[model samples]
Target chain A: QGGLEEALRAWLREDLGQGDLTSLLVVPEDLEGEAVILAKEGGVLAGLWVAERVFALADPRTAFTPLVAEGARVAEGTEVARVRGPLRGILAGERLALNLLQRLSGIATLTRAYVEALAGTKAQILDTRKTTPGLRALEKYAVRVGGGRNHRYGLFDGILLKENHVRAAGGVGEAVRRAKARAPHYLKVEVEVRSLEELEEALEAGADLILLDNFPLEALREAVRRVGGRVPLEASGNMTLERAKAAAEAGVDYVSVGALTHSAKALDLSLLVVRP
Target chain B: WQGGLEEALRAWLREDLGQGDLTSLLVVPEDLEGEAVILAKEGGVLAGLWVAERVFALADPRTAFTPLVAEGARVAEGTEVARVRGPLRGILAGERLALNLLQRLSGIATLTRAYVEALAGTKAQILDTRKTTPGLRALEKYAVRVGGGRNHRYGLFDGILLKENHVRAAGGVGEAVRRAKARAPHYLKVEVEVRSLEELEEALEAGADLILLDNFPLEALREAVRRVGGRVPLEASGNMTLERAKAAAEAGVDYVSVGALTHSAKALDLSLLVVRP
Candidate 1:
């Protein structure tokens, strides 16, 4: 419902401001051709639609046909899709499309590993605010593609009371009450607490979600006990695949991993010219 | 140049996001205050902290981005590169976009430094190609300079290099040179890319001042250097490596163009950690 198309157009313009000058010199304006994208290595596929839309938007002559669905686990050398019409536009559009596709796929690939690591646990794998800029939506989309749930899109949508807000409000209870009073009806308040006393005050203050920050396994179990199912608990900080499993075992409801997007490596993919 | 980065970063954010960030909107409250630190996941030069601050300013207008390590300073892995204190949603909304610019720029700088180092102790200098990220050319080229490397023509409009097609379409090297000499503004350098000794002679005969030796063999490049004898400048492309870069310097070529410095660069890992206390 936002400016999704506007953003995409902006991206296209960012790459092709006015024109691809060098490609224009080499490629005849009327020259038409086609190419297929192949998987450089194996990973979950994403953003096929973005590829199609980018090519068409770059030039109407460009047509994209998807050979595999988004989020597919394709093999190396897998032919995923085809682009036709102006080769120049195709070449011009290729990087923008592939850059995103590979980036999203990389996040998805990493998210999947986290999900697999926590399989059979009741704790859900959650993505944190630590993400690449402008790419949050796509990265979160990939995170879900890899079986993780997004925590929040931005600050406007959720209210997470932290130590600063607590101190600013005079106390944990005051902060929670202020947040509750000031926030919209649909918004839920989550308090980030490191100590058990803060947890007790937050719970008594009536927070809906509790963030267990940097707590060890024993402390986590203690927090889970202290929380007493009063609110859903999310364990974050210094999280690893191993840490997540233990945190899940320790009875937290969710594990927030920031590196899912912050450190996600780009998946390998290449667009080879298949026709002229 | 920083002059155009704000606009580019605007486009970058606008494109990477649509209608505020979906995650931030769903996850954070508009009025909530938060603090976060932008971190380097690995050691490298800091290239985009100011740009990132500008990015946050565009998103929230209140985001306070403080660079712990100044731009161009080498940082260790896990260094707190910058800090952001502002509205939680605003700060988080700018995270991915800001980090993307920082990561990409730092990678280019890191790669450029390697190439510059490879050509150490030589007359030949490392030059970046127009082979830069399409919309991010200026930023990436700026990164090359930060890494101690020099830039080539910014775009086709900046430098007149007659490559394979320009040569054929102009009918020949001499024709291309002559047409460029007459058509180009007096100040621009018109360099011709030649595949052989014959074409090289044609370029020299047409009074071409610079030449590009593409895929030229070691002996051929060495011979061409002797033939030109400092009268004309020579640049090398297509054939590249640290060995070849140093060798090209040894053989007396003026520069080596490495495109992969930008496009093929690996993104440097970085992160943003929020502090509650």
Candidate 2:
């Protein structure tokens, strides 16, 4: 959240001519009013409180009221919430606030659809690192709103020995060995294996978790048997709702999906005046 | 200057600025003196003085610098922040790169200051988003912290957020949270997002310690505050701007998340001035 705020402040300062002059000029200094924000399109609601924060920062006197809570589903034209206080502040903060809400809600909504799609299956939806650069925190938050799970937040958080890391370290065994040797006891070492051969090496080298990268359904099932639950197995690469169930059924512990963060379409949301 | 700084600068110049000062060699004398002014074209908190100094030092070791203001000071438009005196050609050669670092970093610091100021009395700390240029995120985020803001997860591995897709794929929020808790290190805190009062209640019931209240309106936020009853920390995230942060704080959210803090803006306006040798 701190990271998200820092990134957003930098962006706002960058875009608003160092402080959003358009908002300053358009919103009256003392004018105050109340208005409700309606969902023009049906989707999951996310980031409304963030929008409220933006408005309040813009005008301290302004107040916000959320009709739908985060992670809730709503229909088109639903009154999501209302804003009372400085009309100018609300108007000035409207776009930024709405853009965030709509974008995050879109991710959450899409995630919910995927979650619903995979329902009754043992599969779970996960978001990858393919985030919109600085918006990773917020976007991932939206994924949660829609009932999805987040993968790694960044490179520093965990030890994910990828192909490159493996190559540099000599082999899968060596990479896992060195990583395990140096990593703190608290850090779980997850290694990515492209083949069953590498999977065997990783297992021998004592990886805490193994990711079956780009494996077909057959290969994934085979790999699952090979590991037999010594370490948690995660299947990543080219996963969709349909493919996701297949991966889950293959007996892996987690499946990481990049599209949840990178490619999920933005939820359609709009802000309209209840009276004006 | 450290050898690494020199090496990096030389590489940057070779790749981006070109070599041997083509224009200077063509038009100006080797010892010619020129004057330049470092000024704030806009208001912001300033940073990166050492980098600027390094730029001049690497350009010409004998260059003299006169700093009008120190780093971390807030300056308004038209303030003369620093002066450099050196061989004119050297000054000119180093001017762009020096200003580039100064202006860009100062812009980030300034913007961070504004957001920090916006959230002044709240427990909600301002943070930088990952929306940073590749390879420059550390530097940019450093500037934000220097200007009194906090940093979120550095990259994809630091934090575990159980989002919508994960919830769906895992079956439900409870299932997802349980698996995550089972798999995650004890030190790693887990957060879940909820969109409605019901979901918020469900998440709390499921034992989610941290909750992100995504896009809830003011009324919903108030209800969420009451519902949570301080059982868990609440973060208000979405399309937040300076104007809206106060409302979020008032709603009793512990944090306000915004995405526009880094990716959407330009360097706050600043310039470099050269004092003649």
lDDT of 1 by residue, B1-277 (tens): 5476666678667655556554345434577788888778889877877788898898889888888877888888888988899887777667767887888888888877878888877788888875554356678888889988888876544566777545654568887787777666567677888988788888998988789988788899899889998889898877477677777778888888776676567777787787843
TM-score of candidate 2 chain B vs. the reference: 0.86
Best by DockQ: 1
The ten-residue window of minimal lDDT in model 2 chain A covers A11-20
Best by TM-score: 1
DockQ of each model vs. true complex = 0.12, 0.07
RMSD of each: 6.3, 18.1
CAPRI class of candidate 1? incorrect
Which tens-of-lDDT digit does each residue in A1-276 have in candidate 1? 355577678677666666665445445678777777888888888777767878888887888998988877888989989888876787677667877788778788878888888888899999986665456677788898888999877654667765545654666777777766656678788878878888888888888898888887888999988777779999898788899989988888999997787667677777766533
C-alpha displacement of A140 in model 1, angstroms? 2.6
